[PDB]
From Swiss-Prot:
Post-translational modification (record): The iron and 2-oxoglutarate dependent 3-hydroxylation of aspartate and asparagine is (R) stereospecific within EGF domains.
Residues annotated as catalytic: 118 (charge relay system), 167 (charge relay system), 268 (charge relay system)
Involvement in disease: MASP2 deficiency: A disorder that results in autoimmune manifestations, recurrent severe infections, and chronic inflammatory disease.
Name by which UniProt lists this protein: Mannan-binding lectin serine protease 2
Residues of the full protein shown: 364 to 686 of 686
Disulfide bond sites: 5-51, 35-69, 73-187, 233-253, 264-295
Residues annotated as domain Sushi: 3-71
Tissue: Plasma.
Coiled-coil region(s): none
Subunit structure: Homodimer; disulfide-linked. Binds MBL2. Isoform 2 binds to MASP1. Binds SERPING1. Dimerization and MBL2 binding requires calcium ions.
Segments forming domain Peptidase S1: 80-319
Length: 321
């Protein structure tokens, strides 16, 4: 009359292995879950489950739910105006988004893309699936990893063509991307990531947007730029033709007084990344949002969506879908 927990549930990006015996799922039987460990790490459990008296597989912590295989994030082979050419593995989360004008995003997990709302607003509201490409440095190459949007979430505080407050969006991909050295997600900022995002701290913008030549780049470029004091950045946009209060608390600014280093038209949606020097992992602190019309203009800093403000929103959507 012994209870049978049956076959273990499927562990996405993982595997079930029988400890007691091949295919034995009766009371007291033990199994071990593991992840594809090169690119994924097991979270919330050590993966040891046992058949309980109630017919359920339960962890060492007594949880009825599965462990989670989570893509390793923030790896880089490092360890756009006035920049230089990226190398393979430099920005493996970098995503190209087509359909409208050139835009970009950053891979999260193995099935989400973080981008700017302004970059995808028109396409989403024309009910057109987004053509999403990764694993390539060359914008116009026929060789890339193809993904397709299943859903686009635009922040509900964003108002298209009326300022860039809340300029953030999430794309759910219809399939998991195969994670490798050339394709890995960026890390979301942890609580204390602000300690690496103070005035004068260095972030990196990457993209295929306009260079100093005034044309899009064929190959992925990047620049390191300092975070700019918020009041200083606010004052820089306190003039025509900008509407009052264009720079908000949901934005950070980055760039030089001289304009020598900047993100431009076409860089939209890209992640402004920073290095957590303690974990040695890169994370996304900003999204390429807006700036003055002319790229690399002196005294007109690039303005980025302040990603850390949207962690609850991001976690709400990713957890719920
Ligand atoms: Na500008």
């Amino acid at each position: 009359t012994i209870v049978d927990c049956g076959p273990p549930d499927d562990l996405p990006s993982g595997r079930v292995e029988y400890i007691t015996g091949p295919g034995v799922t009766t009371y007291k039987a033990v199994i071990q879950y593991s992840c594809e460990e090169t690119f994924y790490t097991m979270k919330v459990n050590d993966g040891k489950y046992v058949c309980e008296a109630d017919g359920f597989w339960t962890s060492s912590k007594g949880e009825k739910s599965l462990p989670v295989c989570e893509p390793v994030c923030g790896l880089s082979a490092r360890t756009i105006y006035g920049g230089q050419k990226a190398k393979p593995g430099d920005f493996p989360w970098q995503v190209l988004i087509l359909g409208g004008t050139t835009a970009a995003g950053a891979l999260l997990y193995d099935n989400w893309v973080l981008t700017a709302a302004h970059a995808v607003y028109e396409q989403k509201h024309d009910a057109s699936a987004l053509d999403i490409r990764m694993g390539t440095l060359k914008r116009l190459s026929p060789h890339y990893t193809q993904a397709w949007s299943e859903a686009v979430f635009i922040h509900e505080g964003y108002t298209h063509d009326a300022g860039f407050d809340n300029d953030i969006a999430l794309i759910k991909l219809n399939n998991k991307v195969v994670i490798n050295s050339n394709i890995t997600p960026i890390c979301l900022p942890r609580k204390e990531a602000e300690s690496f995002m103070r005035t004068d701290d260095i972030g990196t913008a990457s993209g295929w947007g306009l260079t100093q030549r005034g044309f899009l780049a064929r190959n992925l470029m990047y620049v390191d730029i300092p975070i700019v004091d918020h009041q200083k950045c606010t004052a820089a946009y306190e003039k025509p033709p900008y509407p009052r209060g264009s720079v908000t608390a949901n934005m950070l600014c980055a760039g030089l007084e001289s304009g020598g280093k900047d993100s431009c038209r076409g860089d939209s949606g890209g992640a402004l990344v920073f290095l957590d020097s303690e974990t040695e992992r890169w994370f996304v602190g900003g999204i390429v949002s807006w700036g003055s019309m002319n790229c690399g203009e002196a005294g007109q800093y690039g303005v980025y969506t302040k990603v850390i403000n949207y962690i609850p929103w991001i976690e709400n959507i990713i957890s719920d879908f």
